[PDB]
Design a protein around this ligand. Structure first.
Ligand SMILES: *[C@@H]1O[C@H](CO)[C@@H](O[C@@H]2O[C@H](CO)[C@@H](O[C@@H]3O[C@H](CO)[C@@H](O)[C@H](O)[C@@H]3O)[C@H](O)[C@H]2NC(C)=O)[C@H](O)[C@H]1NC(C)=O
Ligand SMILES: *[C@@H]1O[C@H](CO)[C@@H](O[C@@H]2O[C@H](CO)[C@@H](O[C@@H]3O[C@H](CO)[C@@H](O)[C@H](O)[C@@H]3O)[C@H](O)[C@H]2NC(C)=O)[C@H](O)[C@H]1NC(C)=O
Ligand SMILES: *[C@@H]1O[C@H](CO)[C@@H](O[C@@H]2O[C@H](CO)[C@@H](O)[C@H](O)[C@H]2NC(C)=O)[C@H](O)[C@H]1NC(C)=O
Ligand SMILES: *[C@@H]1O[C@H](CO)[C@@H](O[C@@H]2O[C@H](CO)[C@@H](O)[C@H](O)[C@H]2NC(C)=O)[C@H](O)[C@H]1NC(C)=O
Ligand SMILES: *[C@@H]1O[C@H](CO)[C@@H](O[C@@H]2O[C@H](CO)[C@@H](O)[C@H](O)[C@H]2NC(C)=O)[C@H](O)[C@H]1NC(C)=O
Ligand SMILES: *[C@@H]1O[C@H](CO)[C@@H](O[C@@H]2O[C@H](CO)[C@@H](O)[C@H](O)[C@H]2NC(C)=O)[C@H](O)[C@H]1NC(C)=O
Ligand SMILES: *[C@@H]1O[C@H](CO)[C@@H](O)[C@H](O)[C@H]1NC(C)=O
Lengths: 66, 558, 65
């Protein structure tokens, strides 16, 4: 390749347009990069141990309603 | 000032010796003025002696940076090659400019940031929701409230309020300070500021040795933590304390959970017999408010130690301030220097704690006394923890009941296993509970400096270390907005904190070595070093060399 | 989303294994260190409450084998 050790430059140059699009989309959406509130844990689903076999798919719901 | 301007020196060995002698001849006076103006700051006795300290500190800073610039521009290969210890020590000490390597604007910003951080820590207040005309400060309101009130809600309110108030406005200043310090000490020659701080200990394997040392001390802290957690679970119930998980970092001792002394109220092993905490016997014997220092001096003289110069009893105040708004209370012993004399400046009371502190500061003065013959740069005693270790081994030897009985403060020795266990646990709630701390704090600061902790991972790494080593969970859910490391006093005021851990480890080693040397091969509690001239001679021999040789060699000697 | 999403895991797994081998992680901080690394590098939080009885590193194939 012409370089001794590893480098992230070819990878960064590879994903340049998708990185630019992601940056612009994140700026538009008003998001915060990274994860503050690191000690956040999601709650258990209501009636978790025996409530797993319940369909919660949007496409299935729309098809059933129609 | 022509005295503050370096002269001429050559690259020859005689030239380096001339540099060392000239540094003596100038820095002696410079440190005289600095320490005199330092004494002048007794809580603004006249409100102008403070600005005299500020001007003398600037006066010393300019001279130090000038001498260091001369040494850098003239003494690189001498630092690289010459081999005897004293000149290498002198040249290494003069070579490090510290914050003097930055440009004028950057250095001014650095000093302004340091003063900013110190001030914003000092004047941080906690106010109740009703916004009463009074607002709590850290001293003496918040600390007393946290060390006295056994109310979960009040303790939590005080803890969270102080941590928020003293940490949230301290984040950007600390980030900029870390950047500036890293730049300055990278220009100095070290890879980082943390590397500079570790370089005082002169050990390539310092971190590995420290980790192994803490791994050796783990079971003691584990048992103590389990016992205190059981007591707290009995007191505060089961909802707020988990018998398996950690304990919240407000329910014990201080605000930062470094010392667990204030828990000893509810965790006593044997409460049937009274503990040895007596002050009436001192007053019945008719002690002075100053004769405690005199009996400490005669105790030193007994084992041929501390030939105290008379200037202390005429120019050193050992009492509370009778007149003038002098110091309220601290734990320092400022030296007159002069190449002649020193001084104690402390508070006097009737409790045994004051007597132990008196013995500790007398030991510090003894440390100052022994290395006077050494050059100016060889004033610090080898390892920066040596000062505390030497000043605390004597206090350990003194606080024993046998010492008090043999020196008249106690009618007779209380030879009971229950009393020994009570005293051992009382002293193990500050000399063991602090052991995970210090190590924890300086590991966090090393990580922050080295770049392993970016400004977006301060609280995360801090609380990971707190739960890992100390093992205390935050009662309130924190996040990256908070800066809980800035609540500690030593984080804004830039001061290393591993010295206390090293000294706590070292004082027991010194105590054991002296006890084995003293010829008393028994339990290590009642092992006072009174009336043992050989132990005094050995301690004097070790105390003679201050930074003259690496601390490892002195430790091997002792 | 195939590769960038993977890179932290590759940086993470062998870092945890190095910590375990070096002795910095005794057999009482397995899950603690593992999930600290997972949250620090990957931004992933455990769905259920995991404590030291669990060993959520042997779930990956490359740790046991
Ligand atoms: C470090 O610097 C200080 C200050 O320059 C030096 O202290 C001074 O050392 C000289 C000898 O080099 C002392 O003079 C001697 O004092 C006694 C008087 O009874 C006696 O031994 C000799 O007759 C001689 O006069 C001097 O008192 C002392 N202090 C001052 C304020 O000048 C010190 O020597 C330097 N250390 C090194 C290692 O170079
Ligand atoms: C941290 O230190 C900086 C200095 O590096 C402090 O900056 C200070 O900023 C205030 C305003 O935020 C300045 O007050 C000045 O007052 C008058 C108002 O008419 C006028 O001269 C200026 O427009 C300005 O507002 C102040 O001079 C400036 N410097 C100092 C030394 O205080 C900053 O306040 C410090 N951080 C904190 C949290 O206090
Ligand atoms: C979710 O609700 C929205 C309305 O808030 C739905 O949008 C419309 O839904 C109706 C049926 O209720 C469809 O006939 C329309 O075509 C939908 N509008 C559009 C613009 O698509 C939406 O379909 C619902 N989606 C799901 C997944 O349930
Ligand atoms: C320290 O103690 C001595 C006595 O040991 C003090 O001398 C005072 O003089 C009277 C004379 O009758 C003694 O009985 C008292 O005990 C002393 N008065 C006090 C302590 O108030 C001596 O003044 C003391 N030294 C000081 C205060 O520097
Ligand atoms: C306080 O009590 C302990 C026992 O709990 C004493 O231990 C002594 O130990 C030595 C050997 O190390 C024996 O020869 C003694 O007989 C023990 N003394 C006893 C049992 O009374 C310890 O020495 C005592 N401390 C003091 C200062 O006397
Ligand atoms: C970190 O947690 C703190 C404490 O809950 C959050 O601070 C609160 O934020 C809300 C929403 O912005 C405000 O209404 C409150 O006034 C804040 N309270 C305090 C005491 O500051 C903070 O928002 C969290 N930060 C992040 C990045 O999630
Ligand atoms: C020695 O250095 C000083 C620095 O102040 C300089 O003034 C002087 O000229 C120099 N002398 C010689 C002989 O190099």
């Amino acid at each position: 390749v012409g370089l001794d050790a590893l480098d992230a430059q070819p990878l960064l140059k590879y994903f340049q347009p998708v990185t630019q699009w992601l940056q612009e989309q994140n700026q538009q959406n008003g998001e915060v990069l990274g994860w503050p509130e690191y000690q956040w844990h999601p709650p258990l689903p209501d009636n978790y141990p025996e409530g797993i076999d319940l369909v919660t798919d949007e496409a299935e719901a729309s098809k059933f309603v129609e | 000032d022509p005295g503050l301007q370096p002269g001429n020196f050559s690259a020859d060995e005689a030239g380096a010796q001339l540099f060392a002698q000239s540094y003596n001849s100038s820095a002696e006076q410079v440190l005289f003025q600095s320490v005199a103006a330092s004494w002048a700051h007794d809580t603004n006795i006249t409100a102008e002696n403070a600005r005299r300290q500020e001007e003398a500190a600037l006066l010393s800073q300019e001279f130090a940076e000038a001498w260091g610039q001369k040494a850098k521009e003239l003494y690189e290969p001498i630092w690289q090659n010459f081999t005897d210890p004293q000149l290498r020590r002198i040249i290494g000490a003069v070579r490090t400019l510290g914050s003097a390597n930055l440009p004028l604007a950057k250095r001014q910003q650095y000093n302004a940031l340091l003063s900013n951080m110190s001030r914003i820590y000092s004047t941080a207040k906690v106010c109740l929701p009703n916004k009463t005309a009074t607002c709590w400060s850290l001293d003496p309101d918040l600390t007393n409230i946290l060390a006295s009130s056994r109310s979960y809600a009040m303790l939590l309110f005080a803890w969270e309020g102080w941590h928020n108030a003293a940490g949230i406005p301290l984040k950007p200043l600390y980030e900029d300070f870390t950047a500036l310090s890293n730049e300055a000490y990278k220009q100095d020659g070290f890879t980082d500021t943390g590397a500079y701080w570790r370089s005082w200990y002169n050990s390539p394997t310092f971190e590995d040795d420290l980790e192994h040392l803490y791994q050796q001390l783990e079971p003691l802290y584990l048992n103590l933590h389990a016992f205190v957690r059981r007591a707290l679970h009995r007191r505060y119930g089961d909802r707020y304390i988990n018998l398996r998980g950690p304990i919240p970092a407000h329910l014990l001792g201080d605000m930062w959970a470094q010392s667990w002394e204030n828990i000893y109220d509810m965790v006593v092993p044997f409460p049937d017999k009274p503990n040895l905490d007596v002050t009436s016997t001192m007053l019945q014997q008719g002690w002075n408010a100053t004769h405690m220092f005199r009996v400490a001096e005669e105790f030193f003289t007994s084992l041929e130690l501390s030939p105290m110069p008379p200037e202390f009893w005429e120019g050193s105040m050992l009492e509370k301030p009778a007149d003038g708004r002098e110091v309220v209370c601290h734990a320092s012993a400022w030296d007159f220097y002069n190449r002649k004399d020193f001084r104690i400046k402390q508070c006097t009371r009737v409790t045994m704690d004051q007597l132990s502190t008196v013995h500790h500061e007398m030991g510090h003065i003894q440390y100052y006394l022994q290395y006077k013959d050494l050059p100016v740069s060889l004033r610090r005693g080898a390892n920066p923890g040596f000062h505390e270790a030497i000043g605390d081994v004597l206090a350990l030897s003194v606080s024993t009941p046998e010492h008090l009985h043999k020196i008249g403060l106690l009618d007779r020795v209380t030879n009971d296993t229950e009393s020994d266990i009570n005293y051992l646990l009382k002293m193990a709630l500050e000399k063991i509970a602090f052991l995970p701390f210090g190590y924890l704090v300086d590991q966090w600061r090393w990580g922050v400096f080295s770049g392993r902790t970016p400004p977006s991972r301060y609280n995360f790494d801090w609380w990971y270390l707190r739960t890992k080593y100390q093992g205390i969970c935050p009662p309130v859910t924190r996040n990256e907005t908070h800066f809980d490391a800035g609540a500690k006093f030593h984080v804004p005021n830039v001061t290393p904190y591993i010295r206390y851990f090293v000294s706590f480890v070292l004082q027991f080693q010194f105590h054991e070595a002296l006890c084995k040397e003293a010829g008393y091969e028994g339990p290590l509690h009642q092992c006072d070093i009174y009336r043992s001239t050989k132990a005094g001679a050995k301690l004097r021999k070790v105390l003679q060399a201050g930074s003259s040789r690496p601390w490892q060699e002195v430790l091997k000697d002792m």
